[PDB]
Symmetry: C3
Subunit: 104 residues, 3 copies
Amino acid sequence: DLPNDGGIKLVMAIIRPDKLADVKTALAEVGAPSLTVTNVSGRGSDLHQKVKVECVVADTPAEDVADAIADAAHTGEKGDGKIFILPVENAIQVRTGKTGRDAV
Amino acid sequence: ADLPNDGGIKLVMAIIRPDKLADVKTALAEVGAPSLTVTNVSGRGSQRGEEYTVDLHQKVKVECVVADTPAEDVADAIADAAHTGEKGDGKIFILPVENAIQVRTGKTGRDAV
Amino acid sequence: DLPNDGGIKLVMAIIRPDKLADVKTALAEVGAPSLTVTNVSGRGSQKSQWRGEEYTVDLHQKVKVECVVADTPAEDVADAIADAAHTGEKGDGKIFILPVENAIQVRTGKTGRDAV
Ligand SMILES: Nc1ncnc2c1ncn2[C@@H]1O[C@H](COP(=O)(O)OP(=O)(O)OP(=O)(O)O)[C@@H](O)[C@H]1O
Ligand SMILES: Nc1ncnc2c1ncn2[C@@H]1O[C@H](COP(=O)(O)OP(=O)(O)OP(=O)(O)O)[C@@H](O)[C@H]1O
Ligand SMILES: Nc1ncnc2c1ncn2[C@@H]1O[C@H](COP(=O)(O)OP(=O)(O)OP(=O)(O)O)[C@@H](O)[C@H]1O
């Protein structure tokens, strides 16, 4: 009975640069340590420096990964950022050539 | 009720000219969806020398996640502001978003955007 | 009879920085040369406490390649990138294919799969 309804999701988080370390630890602890980080800038509702964290998940429920990031990135002040979950159709593991959720 | 984006969430991703960022920012504010995330990127589009075949040109990736504003209106606002009429103007893509979380409050779904 | 079931897909690849040149060539050869590149860093899946410490603090430099496709099957684009980026060692990265609903060509105002 597979998480993410047997499929693959991209968890994209825009967070405070100084919260990256915590988020990395939280991802490891939740059992989905894989991430890709980009230096970015933006604004919510003159651009502020942020970090975009991307985690593609299959074995771990996307919401649990997102909640792990949210908790670790939370301060309670404006600028904490947002997390978005996008569908992923397919994945390929470059080293092996394995496909689908098994490649994640 | 008639919520835009069929009651859901969309990611508007635009690859534009670096010097068009200021205009795009203004256009986004004016259309009522000012939120954006910017990345410095490089790329090339479709097919003598190396200029328009192999080399990568500096661009800006603009990402806007929307719910209250129709994705197409946000995309049109970016397109208009980024337009010059010359090769290199870039492209805008709209991707589905399933779910969202506002980190400060823990609010979820379309309300988080 | 249109590829990608008549629709649009985003091919996202996280690869070794030194494999970018090869991937660019492979994309041209497969007939879908369009790409957007970002400098990124990350880590993959998880004995000693030092190599365990190096994991929890250290991110490795990678390149994110993004190709939005319509006329070329997303899998063929992904396979072209995979082949060119392959070394057989840990760190080779991964390729993800995401659905795309719509696209706008900024220059012309053309929309849909035709804008890709
Ligand atoms: N809808 C969105 N689309 C794209 N990027 C966003 C969006 N919302 C937030 N971001 C990114 O997250 C960063 C901070 O977001 P945040 O929501 O904290 O802004 P804010 O104006 O402080 O809002 P709030 O007061 O509700 O926290 C922004 O700099 C931006 O890069
Ligand atoms: N299918 C695509 N996938 C990813 N990025 C793209 C794609 N098409 C365009 N881009 C981005 O847009 C930037 C420039 O715009 P574009 O490539 O559309 O102009 P062009 O193709 O050179 O000219 P024209 O669109 O008039 O043929 C490129 O540097 C690239 O980063
Ligand atoms: N699930 C994922 N989500 C986001 N990014 C990922 C994911 N998996 C891998 N990456 C990106 O790809 C890069 C290399 O990944 P790769 O999977 O080759 O590392 P690895 O897990 O050590 O190798 P292997 O998969 O062969 O065990 C990482 O640095 C990371 O940025």
